[PDB]
Amino acid sequence: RQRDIKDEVWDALEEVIHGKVVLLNRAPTLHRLGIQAFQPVLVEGQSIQLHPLVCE
Amino acid sequence: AEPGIDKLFGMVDSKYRLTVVVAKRAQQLLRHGFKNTVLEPEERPKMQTLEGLFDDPNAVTWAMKELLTGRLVFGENLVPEDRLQKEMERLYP
Amino acid sequence: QKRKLQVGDKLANRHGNKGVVAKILPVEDMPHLPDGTPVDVILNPLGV
Amino acid sequence: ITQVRKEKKGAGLEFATPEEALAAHERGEVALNAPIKVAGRETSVGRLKYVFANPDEALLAVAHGIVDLQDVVTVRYMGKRLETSPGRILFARIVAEAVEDEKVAWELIQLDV
Amino acid sequence: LKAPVFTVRTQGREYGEFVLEPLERGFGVTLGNPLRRILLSSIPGTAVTSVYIEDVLHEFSTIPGVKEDVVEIILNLKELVVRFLNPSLQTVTLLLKAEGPKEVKARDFLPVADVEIMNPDLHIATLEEGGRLNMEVRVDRGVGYVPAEKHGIKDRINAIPVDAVFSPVRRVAFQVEDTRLGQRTDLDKLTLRIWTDGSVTPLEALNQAVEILREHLTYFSNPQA
Amino acid sequence: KLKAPVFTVRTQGREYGEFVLEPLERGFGVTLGNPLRRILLSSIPGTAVTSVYIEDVLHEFSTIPGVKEDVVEIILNLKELVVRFLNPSLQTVTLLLKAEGPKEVKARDFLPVADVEIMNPDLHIATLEEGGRLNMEVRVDRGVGYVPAEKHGIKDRINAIPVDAVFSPVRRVAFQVEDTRLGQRTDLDKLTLRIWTDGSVTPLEALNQAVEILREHLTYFSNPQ
Amino acid sequence: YDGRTGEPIEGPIVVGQMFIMKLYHMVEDKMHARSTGPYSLITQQPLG
Ligand SMILES: [Mg+2]
Ligand SMILES: [Mg+2]
Known part of the structure; x- marks a missing residue:
C-alpha cells in the first residue's frame, strides 16, 4: 500500500542501490551502445534522467 | 568512471580477465563477510548514511579497491579450488 | 484525478515542435522582461 | 566564446606609433578589433590597448565589462605573450582544470580556432 | 561614497x-x-487551503442551482485575497451562506474578527433561483506554493484540499x-x-x-x- | 521553517x-x-601599481637597452606584484628600485618603505645584463576592482607610464x-x-x-x- | 534579464506568446517497473 510506506524505506533504498548500476536500453539497439550501465540516482518524479553526452 | 579504471585495465592482458578477478574477489568478500579483506581500516570503502559513515556494502567496490593496492595475487592455476576454499574457511570462519 | 503538468509530460505546438518537460523552475529563476514579467516556457532555438 | 569579433570601422588605417592607433580609437575612428597596421605589423587596437599579465586579470576585466569574451587582446599565458580573446584563454583553462595538467592540456587544444 | x-x-x-x-x-x-x-x-502570506461545500463530496461535481462547478468555484477561491490583521493568527475559516438568484461575491463571506478581504468584488459563483451555496473556506498562512497533494488539509470528511499559493x-x-x-x-x-x-x-x-x-x-x- | x-x-x-x-x-x-x-x-x-616611471623610457611600447624584458613585460610583472599596506592611514606610496646588471631583478630589490610589505618578494621583475641600468619608480595606490590605465590615467611625472591597476x-x-x-x-x-x-x-x-x-x-x- | 544572476542575456532574445498543447502521452501513464509477477503459461517467461 502506497500510504503504508514510511519515510525510512526511502533511506534504506538509498543504501540498497549504493555502488550498484542499472542498464538503460533504448530500442532499436542498433549497436552495442544501445545498452549502457549507469549508477542510479534516486529522483522525485516518474521520468528517467539521461545524461546529454550519451544521447548520440 | 570507476576510480583507477585505467590502472585496473593495465594490470591484465584482457579486460575480461579484470572482470573475472573483480567478481570472484567480490564473492570471496561476501562469503566471508568482508573479514578476509586486504584493506587497512583507513582504506575500507565507506558510505554516507544518516546515522554516520559505515562500511560500503558493495563488494564489487571493495574488490576493485583491493585490487588497486596490489596485495591480491590473481592468475590461472594458482591453487586448487577445494584447497583454496578449505584454507579460507579456516583462516576466516 | 486532476493531472497537473509535471516533468516528463509531453508538450507541443501546432508547427510540429514537440518535447517533454525536463525542468520546472520557480518564478524567480525564469528569465523575465525588464518590466518584471517572467516567461512561461523556454524553447531551444536549435530545433528550428 | 572561442569565436573572435571582426570589426570594420578602422579596417585598414595605418599609423606611425601605437599611441596614434590608440588615439584614434578614443576618437571613435577605429574599432577595437578592426585590423590595422601600427608601424609595419598588422594588429588591432585591442591587442595594444589591453595587455593582461595572466588569465586571471583577463577574466577579471571581462567581469567588469572592460572587454568581452570575443574581443581579441594580449594575454601572458604560460610564459608566452599570446594574442587571443579571453574566451579562448577561458577555454584553455577549462581543459587545464578538467584534466588537472596545465602543460598537457595546452598540447591538446587548438587555441587559434 | x-x-x-x-x-x-x-x-x-x-x-x-x-x-x-x-x-x-x-x-x-x-x-x-x-x-x-x-x-x-x-x-x-495567506491563501485558501481547504474548502467544504454542503452536499458536495468531491471537486468533480456540480451543485444544483449553481452555474459553476466545484472546480471553477475552487479556481475562483484561489484568487481570494485574505489579510490577517493579527500577527498571531495562523488559520481562519470563512463561512458563506447564499441563496439564489444572486451572484455570490467574496464580500458575502460572514465577517470574522481580525480578518479583512482585500478583493470584496471577486466573483465566486452565480446562483440560480432555487440554488443554495453553503460553504466553509479555510484560509491558512504560509510561504511558497504548496500543492493540495502535499498539505492535504481537510477540516472534515468532505473537505476538498486546494493548492495554496501563499x-x-x-x-x-x-x-x-x-x-x-x-x-x-x-x-x-x-x-x-x-x-x-x-x-x-x-x-x-x-x-x-x-x-x-x-x-x-x-x-x-x-x-x- | 528550515x-x-x-x-x-x-x-x-x-x-x-x-x-x-x-x-x-x-x-x-x-x-x-x-x-x-x-x-x-x-x-x-586592495592595493595595486597604478603608475611606473623608468629612466630613459619614452613609451610603454619601447625597449630598454641592456635588459631582456621590454617595457611591456616589466609592466606586466608589476601587475603581478602583491603589496600590503600595514598602516591604515597610508594611502599611496612610491617604490624605488635601482639595479645593476647582470643580476636578475626581484620584488625584494625594491627599497623598503615604512609600513609597506611586499607579499611576494620572489617575484621576477626584470633580467639585466652587463652594462645595463634599471632605474624604476612605481607608484602603488589603494582601491577596489579593476581600473584600466587609460581610465585612471595616473602619472607622477613626465614620461610616466600608467598601468592597469588590479586593485x-x-x-x-x-x-x-x-x-x-x-x-x-x-x-x-x-x-x-x-x-x-x-x-x-x-x-x-x-x-x-x-x-x-x-x-x-x-x-x-x-x-x- | 536572467532571474538567477539579474544580469541580462548578452543578446536580445525572441520572446513572445505561443500556443502550446499538452499531449495525451504523459509520464504518469507510461512509467512501469517490476521485480516479480505473472508468468506465461507455456514458456513460463514473464508477461508483457
Ligand atoms: Mg593598456
Ligand atoms: Mg493569493
Missing part, C-alpha cells in the same frame, strides 16, 4: 517604488536581484539607472518595483525580504572546519 | 579556500552566491549550487563558494568583507525619504 538616500513611492497597498541612490557601479544588480528572488519566493507578491521588477555624483558618472540608481495582492503592503514585503537576506548573511559567521 | 545551515571552510594556504553552506532553501544558493561573487570581484579593498585582492571566484536533501525535503540547495586570492587577504577574510559589504548595503533600506 556617502549613504544612499532611500525614497519610497506607494500607490495604495498593492504597488510601491523604492529608490536607492547613489550606489557604486554594479551594486544595482548586486542588491536588486537578491531582493527580487526573495520577494518572489520567500514572502509569507506568496502575496505578484510581480517584482528592479531598474538600474545611470546616476552621477560629483565627478564620477559610473554610479547606479536602483529602483525596486513591487506588486502585491494588498494583504501585505510592498513596503512590508521589502522589509521582510531585507530581513531574510540579512538573516541569511549571518550564516557566514561561524566557520566550522 | 534549520540553520552549517558553514564549513576548507582553506589551503592564504590564496585559496572552499566554503560550503548547507542546507539552504531552494534557490537561495543562487540568491546568496551571485551577490557575494559580485562584491568579491569588485568591492574588496582587487580576489583573483577569481567560482560558486556552485548543488541539490541536497534533509529527510523528505528534496529541493534544498547546497552552496559551495570557492575564492582565489593574491595572498594579501585570506579568502576567508575576503568573504567576511564581502558579507559585511552586503550586510551594510541592506541597512540602507531603513529611512524612507
